[PDB]
Symmetry: C3
Subunit: 114 residues, 3 copies
């Protein structure tokens, strides 16, 4: 999978090893090889949640399979947990959009996964 | 819903109260509680529309329901109107991708909306 | 269509005219007037691919139609080729999410394409 997090939290508050932790945790959560996992963190964003600019985050998780009711609940617990612990963002100020991608709609290495 | 606007307009040109206005207007437009609305503005982007670097914007609106033919036309009029008035972006240089998300695919507060 | 590229490569490494090149190349690849094509490049991002922060990119291509198995493979060869040549990013460190949008879900000029 690939995970993206956009947040108003400042870059200086993103701890060393954050991308690495996300990569490993997502590998364990989806059972996928970490070598194909991509993570992207975007701090210092101009955003609001409920009209308030206290710390918040807007994220997305794309995956070819491994997306579903129970799985997404598990991913949300894991990811909100990491955002609260590492970036001090309250879980109720985090949204995560989940996308189950068809292999044919994911390009990589001059081709697709189809 | 959550609304994201990516634009080449510089940060200094984003007026005070913009995020607040988007939050209130989207709440009114969708009938959703403002406490749930998330807004994200990304200025100073390197982008082109029709090959031209004049002011433009690429946006997205995700919502669990309240997405449809007539509704999307109304949101586009509302949002393009705000971008034109506040950021001075011509409506024909704005694209807005609409997504009707399944509740199970939207994470929040350690779980999902399902 | 609209093409977005998020990458960790330096802004200084993005060639002048890259946005125009992407615009013209995509116009040819889709047989669409360049006037409709939007391109967005985001450099200097904090990201990792396979746990490594060597050059990589996360992209998306949204189009109303013209999305499919064979077409996406073609777009991937074209886009990875440009990223490798212009941004020096290895094709195997690039992901491109393809989206076939319904006209009703694409806002533009105060309305939608429906
Ligand atoms: C996790 S193994 N990501 C690798 C495949 C993928 C899935 C969705 C989007 C991009 C790449
Ligand atoms: C508007 S009420 N947003 C709150 C629920 C939501 C819907 C789609 C994506 C993220 C969050
Ligand atoms: C290519 S012709 N872009 C113009 C229509 C479009 C399609 C998808 C998303 C935004 C705009
Ligand atoms: Cl599941
Ligand atoms: Cl469950
Ligand atoms: Cl898909
Ligand atoms: Cl409708
Ligand atoms: Cl209508
Ligand atoms: Cl969905
Ligand atoms: Cl329920
Ligand atoms: Cl095809
Ligand atoms: Cl769609
Ligand atoms: Na899907
Ligand atoms: Na949908
Ligand atoms: Na689609």
């Amino acid at each position: 999978p690939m995970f993206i997090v956009n947040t108003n939290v400042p870059r200086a508050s993103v701890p060393d090893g954050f991308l690495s932790e996300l990569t490993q945790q997502l590998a364990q959560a989806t059972g996928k090889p970490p070598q194909y996992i991509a993570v992207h963190v975007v701090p210092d964003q101009l955003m609001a949640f409920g009209g308030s600019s206290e710390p918040c985050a807007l994220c997305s998780l794309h995956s070819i399979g491994k997306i579903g009711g129970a799985q997404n609940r598990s991913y949300s617990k894991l990811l909100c947990g990491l955002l609260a612990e590492r970036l001090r963002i309250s879980p109720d100020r985090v949204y995560i959009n989940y996308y189950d991608m068809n292999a044919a709609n994911v390009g990589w290495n001059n081709s697709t996964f189809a």
